[PDB]
Each structure stands twice: as structure tokens, then as C-alpha cells.
Amino acid sequence: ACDYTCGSNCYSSSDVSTAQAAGYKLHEDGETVGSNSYPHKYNNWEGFDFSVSSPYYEYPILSSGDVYSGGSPGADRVVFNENNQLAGVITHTGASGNNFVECT
């Protein structure tokens, strides 16, 4: 079963946890990754009511299972905060333009 379903992608708790650990780690060293410099800030234009506190940072989660280290970031992201908390999992899939919809 899927703990998180991002359109076509099936992500498990373990998947989310791995990406998230990679992002908070970069964020902690003050280092980026890719041409879009992940992780960066998630502004929250979508206006999601996260059960966690701002500010937010995003980091790509790959359907491939591997951790992002460059190349296409895909459509799915993991959102965590300064305390290393999971805000959620979002995707551009089924979302107009660069908008975001949440993974089910």
C-alpha cells in the first residue's frame, strides 16, 4: 500500500523519511544540490494548513527510490521545517502550472 500517493508515484513512510533526512542535512550544513538549489524554501502560496510550524523547506522525493543529487527533480517534494518536522508531501502533478497539490 502507499503511505503517500503523489499522482502516479507510491511513496512509503520510509521513502519520505529518507529524502527528508537528506534535505535537513544539506540545510544544516548550508549546502545546496541541483540547478534549483534543493533544499530551498517552500512559501506556502497554496495555503496548506500544516500541523507543523513555519518556516518550511522543500526537497525532491524521487519515484526511483534514490535520493536527489542533481538532474530532474521530478514533480514530488517532501516539506519539513527548522525542527526537522514533516509538514507534508506535495506534488505538481494534477496541479496547474507550477502549483502544488498534496499527496494523498
Ligand SMILES: Nc1nc2c(ncn2[C@@H]2O[C@H](CO)[C@@H](O)[C@H]2OP(=O)(O)O)c(=O)[nH]1
Ligand atoms: N507552487 C509553489 N512553488 C513554490 C512555493 N515556494 C517556493 N516555490 C518554488 O517556486 C517555483 C515557482 O516559480 C515552484 O516551482 C517551486 O519550486 P520547485 O519546483 O523547486 O518546488 C510555494 O509555496 N508554491
Ligand SMILES: [Ca+2]
Ligand atoms: Ca519506495
